[PDB]
């Protein structure tokens, strides 16, 4: 259930617009499951609204918070499902660098993936 | 359910 297919581009834009208008300080994020994934538990929430002072490291933890896992096993958070980015980078950097056409930033969580 | 998770600070 990928978001880019669920919602048409114009709709996604409308959403991004209304919400960036609603919260002009926060980045809009779409975290999805790696479709090749079967091991990890699904993520109940799909859309995240994050501050700019937030780091990837913190966001990953927040995403982890929504899932019940053995306190040890980590997973990878791919931006655009193709970019392994700096753990230290802020949401703002990731936003400016990897902004999708519709204004969202798209992420994908995977326990393992091969390219 | 297609709705936002609002995080802050």
Numbering used by the authors:
A (entry chain A): 1 to 115
B (entry chain B): 3 to 11
Task: Give sentences from the paper.
All six mATG8s are essential for autophagy, are conjugated to autophagosomes and serve to recruit two broad classes of molecules: autophagy receptors and autophagy adaptors. On the other hand, autophagy adaptor proteins interact with mATG8 proteins on the convex autophagosomal membrane surface and can regulate autophagosome formation (ULK1/2 16), autophagosome transport (FYCO1 17), crosstalk with the endocytic network (TBC1D5 18) and autophagosome fusion with the lysosome (PLEKHM1 19), but are themselves not degraded by autophagy. To provide a molecular basis for the specificity of the PLEKHM1‐LIR interaction with the mATG8 proteins, we solved the crystal structures of PLEKHM1‐LIR in complex with the LC3A, LC3C, GABARAP and GABARAP‐L1 proteins.
LC3C could not be crystallized as a chimeric construct, but co‐crystals of LC3C with the PLEKHM1‐LIR peptide (residues 629–642) diffracted to 2.19 Å resolution. Partner residues in each mATG8 protein are given W635 of PLEKHM1 interacts with E19 of LC3A with 3.5 Å distance, with D19 of LC3B and E25 in LC3C in similar way, but the bond distances are higher (6.2 Å and 4.5 Å), suggesting a weaker interaction. For the LC3 subfamily proteins, the hydrogen bonding distance of N637 (LIR) with K30 (LC3) correlates with binding affinity to the LIR peptide. In the LC3 subfamily proteins (left plot), R70/70/76 (LC3A/B/C) side chains are closer to the CG1/2 atoms of V638 (˜3.6/3.7/4.1 Å), while for GABARAP subfamily (right plot) these distances are 4.6 Å (GABARAP) and 4.2 Å (GABARAP‐L1). Due to this closer proximity, R70/70/76 polar groups become more fixed in their position and organize neighbouring negatively charged carboxyl groups of the D48/48/54 via salt bridges. V51 GABARAPs’ side chains are in close proximity to the PLEKHM1 V638 (3.8 and 4.3 Å for GABARAP and GABARAP‐L1, respectively), while side chains of residues in equivalent positions of LC3 subfamily proteins are further away (LC3A/B/C V54/V54/V60 – 4.2/4.6/4.6 Å).
